[PDB]
Design a protein around this ligand. Structure first.
Ligand code: FAD
Ligand code: FAD
Ligand code: FAD
Ligand code: FAD
Ligand code: CA
Ligand code: CA
Lengths: 445, 447, 441, 455
């Protein structure tokens, strides 16, 4: 894909260059490839596209690239295969380019290491370096008129200098993932670290791996369990405590009929349901969110707990402990003492002294609201929320916005499009749909 | 255990001889063995006990002994081991007696075939044949007074119907156990028809209705738990030319949770914790702890069913033309079954707040566990003032008015106490330990 | 690929259209696709290729398409992916074309049903229908002092007529022929595993009759037939006769299975004759001479259930007899059953049929090539393939523009993967380069 | 349980070693004397005079190889009692019940306990025989005893042992001897003596003191390709995260253990009769066709974890020669060179293929040697009685019931010597394992004490 000059009026600008935007770039590449679409042989003009990414290079959840962590999803659900297995951007073709395809085949697994899947996506992203501006953190999207709004100005701050630059585009995609969700009761402190900063921030805080640190973990989903488990290996003499509101870690549902909710063609079914039915369906399938844990990991943690029981029958004396049905009422963290004191109570309708508290409570996916505040008056009268259509384009007042201008949301549409919306599950197929939604008419010539 | 003359006054009578009562028989045998508890060499009188069972011989859910069906619970949770691995009634000792222990070890499984686990319990039950009266269906329990002008009940008379002749018999006992499992729960909208069969009568009744294994029958299955899936899977083999249809309210068959922390709710020692919780917490825990007992399907069976549907997809991409189909998120609104036509018409709608014509409808909708209320109606006036339900204590004895019932008489409930004692109550999970508790509760002082 | 007239001089004729020839066809198609290799936009001439296959349509071991039978190899080792995942002939693209890709993904398996993998190869094969003559059984290859082409004669299986085609280069890719123990007699009741699904139901028509059926062997095919008979003829009495003491599991462990990697062919081929011979023994625990662990366990479980019902093994409906050999079969006379005599391999059975699951010989190319074996270098009594599978010829008797290639029968020189699906995709690429490379430049 | 016999009295049986094999005998004797388990034992008012001598200071089971996460290779049903009598108080399940852990083990859904747990189970069994086990006693010889100088016939034996802490020699007299001493470390010949060359049996006990700083980038080599080699190779990579470990194997690859049910029937207790009755040639051949289930192979699950770990190295760097942890297949050690503790040792390698020639040198801080065990130490212990064997025998020959052949004109039939754990050649691969101990313990009690228990 060839670059567009910074000051030209773009056809599409995408905010963020994680897997969701990367899937759009790949699908646009594939749509322009005469090998993949026969009609693309007669397309001599590439749309003017640009991506703004805050990081200095492509990276995927590097704070949680914990040792031995695996993908939670089959590699067939990579960024291209479910749309076109012939794509050059498939995981298997990436392995072939690295000389690793037979070696991966002998693993007999559908679940690559997360480190490996990140490298796969890094390898894909490098092929889009002419249209990705790294180190650009978008701060706002502003209306533009050339009395109907027909373009948008996207302002971004360069991470190295702090300077604000502006780009004009007819269409915008917001694909910025999630922001760390912290319980409101917790204070800010270098010893309280969210799961998104585990690998990147915790080793600097606790530098001596042999010290008997007391480390608490708040949560009961996949990241909490991974952090609890990894800490016991990384700090072999530590005392770790898992604080959970629930009565037990719960396994993710890997059964085949249930997992059909992640099928790409199921987005059509989910979207067509009423709000009441969508709301309840998202709970009747709670057992496959990031609120649950891979069975294998639950079993490994249980086995580790059992071995403590063999050595000592008194669970309160264990080096590593799980405290179910608890909530944090208070954190004391002021003073020269290097440990904080955490006060715990039952979560139905006790104090720890810790060197650190890892908080694995997931993410908010509302950061697009701040970015879009200066265009929210273009929504239909009476709307206080952005409403995405089936093709992820947000509803606009047609008398205020030209039909050739628009804004799409990616990754924050679980309520309308289903649990798969924030995952890798449907990115390949969705990237293709996005190309048809945004560029279809333009590509028709 | 030696028999008591049928017309004598018993110390204990148990209604039903399924796993729950058998575990009591086993636990009492073990309590009387001076080798297993030393404090028993000085017992020179065995309690007078008898069990009444309506089936003609011991059998465990024989209507659902589907070929290849497996236990859903580890064999370690047999009828003795969790109470005493030394008991002669453990599953591993049964295998040793049959000459099969090394061969089972090489299976490397915790889940025996249901056929084998039934035979294990059959092997246990034969050792009590002198104290089990088969072919007797208890119909009522009535008050008994040694002195008729006394104001206090000191025994109960248990009346039973001979299943072969219909004669009513009576036995007297100081104490009564009701361990009668469940009765078929049928959706209230369904009509009565010999072509509508509950899952509990699958193996025994459906082959009599559909005699031609080669006819292309249309057979529907209602439900989405373990029994529905087993019947759905088995029908495709037993009637190879049939067209089977699985009708479920839910959107998908859901797997049983086999993960280790969740399943601790089935631990025997959790019964104390659960029982002592408030009504509000117990009611909430029963919803949040785990999906209902047989309301979900063993993962392995789901995958086998899924693979079979995939193979249909390989042969024909059009799901509507498949021989075997799943119709999720449906409810039955009407069944037409009148006229000389031998197929019924089932009317379907979405299950959120279509027609099949079938030769048979298997209904895999579980059980009610309230039949003790009918059996005990003639003694329910002995409950404390104002009670309209039987209320069991921790040791499963129901509350009685102490001024109306002698303290040497009582009634215990087994298997119907999920509300007060937890999800494990109706399962095999805690029978070994519970049988031990029941022996202490019922015979402890006497022993 | 466009068809070339039958009587023209072909560039290549391949004998057989099984997976091995199909992978060559696929690789040739891919070599001509400018979309896959850029150096192909300036290739304006397709080579003249033709395939002769004796079956009437594409079919893959249909005598062993037993219900529930599964692939023994990961689907990634299909006919293209290991050579080029972008190919339109991958198993995943096939599933996508069938509208089944997400549905297979939810199976969470690398091992498709054999029925499905056959349909994948059938779907591939249909794209070459213009260059494949089905129902043609090749009977001889004849030279044509410089032999500079070959004439391949084939017998039409339906009419019996013999037809001939001329080509400069020949590939022999005919798999294996049924290996029958030399002591067994010929009798319609003695059937090799390769004709199980095809022939036994013709012999034993009543699925409910209490037939006595023996199975001879202990490998994957023996176990599949033994297991299947118990479902296909539910009242039968089956007996598994094996020389070994037990069914042995196939080794699925990752280090051992690296001998099947495509890049191992270079290493194996370059080893001395002595090392190749020993290497084939010291890793032969994976030759269809062993059984998928899952199947062993299912069979053992079935035997266990018989033990639950009757502790006396001699009374079981279905039995395994280890460490046995057949010493004599009586099959002369009107009695519908044969009597099999057994002895220790360190007792008589009366059977309606005997299935023989003893594998295959891979020497049938010698008979086909006898009329050109004088073109070998002096003193050679065996066909000797180079690394690129082309057989050695005397250069003063054979033009360098003519040659003969062997496929699937070269285990001794190229390794255990040679007769499997394991390296077909990569080998197809090598074969296209060996036979057509200069022509493509 | 069993009451002690005074040290200087004439014992009925003395067992050399108190590992699992002798422990199964003690357990089986206890059970034979238990009226709950054997009906005929309420009328047994005299316990045989039995004693066990164990050189370690307390019961311990392969403590050098109690590596973190290590598992049993065998189903817990094959414990020290269950296959003989599941009602026994010494079953693993009864042990779990006594520890208050049975339901917790049930929720593990595994037949393969941690080795740490299975050792504790056997320690729990052993503690009940503490009155008849003399720990810290290393038996050094067995000598003939003639209770009558007016006779040449040997009718008892004297067993001498050296106390490992004081060095004093103690002597006990017995009619019957069991030798159940497991194996001695099998070391490649030619190796120099250096405390950094550690056999797998001393891994957990010796290596951590040698390499104290878990963060240091040590170079550690591992020799072997069986289960112990793989466990050590894997464990080293976790215990020393910055180390460079190298696995040296003669074979081309680590091989998986055969877990299939028909093959594993060779381990059934009732198969000892069939194996024992075979000819010498057939037994020799049968041992070779089943050498794929010894400790010479690796649990599939562990192979896969090691393979996965190697693959992750491939992702970071395609150059295998630069990997932190490496496997060098088809290699043999030609020499191990050292220059004093101040320096690293040099391991020299060559191809193990026939001399039909790549080579390497490694510089390592330690070398772990996982090359198995010899099981012939009974010959040294029995040297002073080997003249009592039948004419022409240069080997101890055990009968079916494990009693060795003696010249009847030199030895009374009321005296005898039995061997346990070293009889694979006559009794099969299970002989050295846990696989048939429960049943064999029963047989040994009948062989040694049967008549005595009857009368
Ligand atoms: C360890 C882990 C934990 C996970 N936890 C959850 C979870 O709790 N819930 C859930 O539904 N999914 C979760 N996922 C799945 C995850 O969301 C998907 O795998 C995938 O990351 C989604 O891609 P995305 O591009 O929509 O978001 P991302 O992977 O988040 O990509 C967003 C990109 O936008 C960039 N960006 C953000 N803001 C700006 C800005 N203002 N300007 C410029 N660039 C910006 C970011 O730097 C980032 O590169 C998790 C995955 C992993 C690996
Ligand atoms: C196929 C199958 C399905 C199951 N479904 C469920 C389920 O839906 N929900 C759940 O919680 N558990 C279910 N279970 C578990 C089951 O309840 C236990 O395994 C076990 O059967 C409980 O033993 P019980 O003795 O309390 O009941 P049972 O096994 O039912 O024993 C009850 C006995 O009492 C006899 N009896 C009944 N009434 C009388 C009478 N009036 N007079 C004399 N005798 C009488 C019966 O004949 C029977 O033998 C199921 C098990 C199987 C195998
Ligand atoms: C059920 C089963 C059993 C197997 N057993 C073994 C085994 O015992 N040992 C082993 O090493 N591999 C075995 N395999 C693997 C098998 O060889 C490969 O999967 C694959 O079939 C090899 O492809 P091929 O094209 O080389 O042979 P094939 O699949 O055999 O193809 C050969 C083709 O040539 C055709 N042909 C034969 N003769 C002629 C002729 N004279 N003229 C024209 N056409 C002809 C045949 O009709 C056939 O289509 C087995 C596979 C399966 C599915
Ligand atoms: C890590 C590990 C590795 C194994 N490797 C092998 C293997 O390579 N090959 C194989 O066939 N089996 C192997 N096994 C199986 C093992 O042999 C059995 O599990 C079990 O230990 C056998 O019991 P045993 O009592 O016969 O021998 P051991 O368990 O070794 O017990 C022998 C006891 O005798 C004591 N003893 C020795 N000499 C004397 C003496 N002179 N005086 C007094 N006491 C003495 C020892 O201290 C020891 O306690 C291994 C097991 C484990 C856990
Ligand atoms: Ca479990
Ligand atoms: Ca594998």
């Amino acid at each position: 894909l060839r670059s567009t000059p910074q000051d030209e009026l773009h056809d599409l600008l995408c905010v963020g260059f994680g897997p969701a935007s990367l899937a759009i770039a790949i699908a646009l590449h594939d749509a322009l490839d005469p090998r993949l679409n026969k009609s693309a042989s007669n397309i001599h003009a590439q749309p003017k596209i640009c991506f703004l990414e805050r990081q200095k290079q492509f990276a995927w959840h590097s704070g949680m690239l914990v040792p031995g962590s695996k993908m939670q999803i089959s590699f067939i659900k990579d960024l291209a295969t479910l749309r076109d297995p012939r794509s050059s951007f498939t995981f298997l073709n990436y392995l072939h380019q690295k000389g690793r395809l037979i070696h991966f085949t002998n693993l007999s697994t559908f679940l690559p290491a997360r480190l490996e899947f990140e490298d796969y996506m890094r390898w894909c992203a490098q092929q889009f370096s002419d249209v990705v501006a790294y180190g650009e953190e978008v701060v706002e999207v502003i209306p533009g008129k050339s009395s109907v709004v027909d373009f948008f100005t996207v302002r971004s701050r360069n991470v190295e200098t702090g300077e604000i630059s502006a780009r004009r585009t007819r269409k915008v995609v917001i694909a910025i993932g999630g922001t760390a969700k912290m319980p409101s009761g917790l204070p800010q402190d270098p010893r309280i670290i969210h799961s998104s900063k585990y690998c990147t921030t915790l080793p600097a805080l606790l530098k001596d791996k042999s010290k008997p640190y007391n480390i608490a973990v708040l949560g009961s989903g996949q990241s909490a369990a991974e952090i609890f488990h990894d800490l016991q290996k990384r700090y072999p003499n530590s005392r770790t405590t898992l604080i959970m509101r629930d009565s037990a870690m719960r396994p993710s549902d890997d059964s085949p009929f249930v997992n059909e909710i992640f099928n790409p063609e199921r987005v059509d079914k989910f979207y067509s349901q009423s709000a009441a039915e969508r709301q309840r369906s998202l709970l009747a399938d709670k057992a496959t969110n990031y609120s649950v844990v891979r069975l294998e990991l639950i079993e490994e943690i249980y086995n580790d707990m059992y071995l403590q029981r063999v050595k000592n029958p008194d669970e309160t004396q264990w080096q590593h402990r799980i405290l179910p049905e608890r909530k944090i009422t208070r954190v004391e963290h002021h003073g020269p003492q290097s440990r904080m004191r955490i006060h715990l109570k039952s979560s139905k309708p006790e104090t720890l002294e810790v060197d650190a508290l890892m908080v694995a409570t997931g993410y908010n996916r509302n950061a697009h609201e701040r970015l879009l505040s200066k265009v929210q008056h273009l929504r239909p009268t009476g709307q206080d929320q952005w409403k995405p259509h089936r093709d992820y384009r947000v509803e606009m007042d047609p008398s205020k916005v030209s039909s050739e201008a628009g804004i799409w949301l990616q990754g924050c549409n679980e309520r309308t499009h289903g649990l798969s919306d924030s995952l890798l599950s449907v990115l390949a197929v969705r990237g293709g749909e996005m190309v048809q939604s945004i560029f279809g008419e333009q590509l028709e010539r």
